[model samples]
Target chain A: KIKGNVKWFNESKGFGFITPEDGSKDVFVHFSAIQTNGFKTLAEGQRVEFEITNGAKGPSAANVTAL
Target chain B: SHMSKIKGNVKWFNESKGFGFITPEDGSKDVFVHFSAIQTNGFKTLAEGQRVEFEITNGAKGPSAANVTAL
Candidate 1:
């Protein structure tokens, strides 16, 4: 899984971008991709781990979890 | 200066009205949310039953949600 910090997230829109720790392109993340038992959300600057997939838009993060 | 992260679920939303109420997980009263307070780059809409995190501020009216992010 890749590690990164949440760059920004829109709570109402249910989407955001994460900046990888290794300095790669910011990966798009959707709320549906988050794996959480209760509330599925991320705070700005919060560290997270996730897998990446190639999408038409760009790289997207899936199965995201707080680290 | 009393900012806090609160967990809640979208109770209901009216796209035309651009306002809704969020029921806090802690069992408190529902907080009011406005589209303008949503931190999104695109359409500012929230689905019912969708979980979220947000900061609340006590306004003259009551508690209002801000920086709301969907879970």
Candidate 2:
């Protein structure tokens, strides 16, 4: 999976962006993409691994997991 | 212009995320890989345990794989 750090996340809005280690454009991530139990929220600056998809707008992250 | 060519097996991949990790044949730590780095046309994907060759560069966060090609 592509490795990145959580750039920012809004727990209340359930969305955020992940900056890929490759220095590419930030990929959009939604809380629903997180692979976790119970509360699915991510913290800024947290290391993460995920897959990417070409969305209508741009790249989006999915299957996100905390490192 | 220096680049390291390495061989590895795809340890795991999340199709939805378009990314995965590759366990280097030399037993180095897994390298981060992104779909955009694949050098093939059409839909690109790697199955678990699939062999691949790629070039790697030490990125800001860590080792990132590029120019990946399925072997």
All candidates: DockQ: 0.02, 0.07
User: First chain of model 1: TM-score?
Assistant: 0.91
What is the iRMS for every candidate structure?
Answer: 10.7, 9.0
lDDT of 1 by residue, A29-64 (tens): 888888888766777788999999986435799889
Candidate 2 stretches greater than 4 Å from native: A1-67, B1-4, B59-61
| Clash list (residue pairs), candidate 1 | A11-B68, A11-B69, A11-B70, A40-B71
Cα displacement (angstroms), candidate 2, residue A32, comes to 16
TM-score of chain A of each: 0.91, 0.91
Instruction: Quote fnat for model 2.
Output: 0.00
What digit string (tens of lDDT, one per residue) describes model 1 on residues B1-71? 34478789997665554666788887865676878888767999888788999887753224678999988
Give the alpha-carbon lDDT of every model.
Answer: 0.77, 0.79
What is candidate 2's TM-score for chain B alone? 0.86
TM-score of every candidate relative to the true structure = 0.48, 0.50
How well is each residue in A1-67 modelled by candidate 2, as lDDT tens digits? 8899986565765776788999876677878899997788887689999999876425799899989
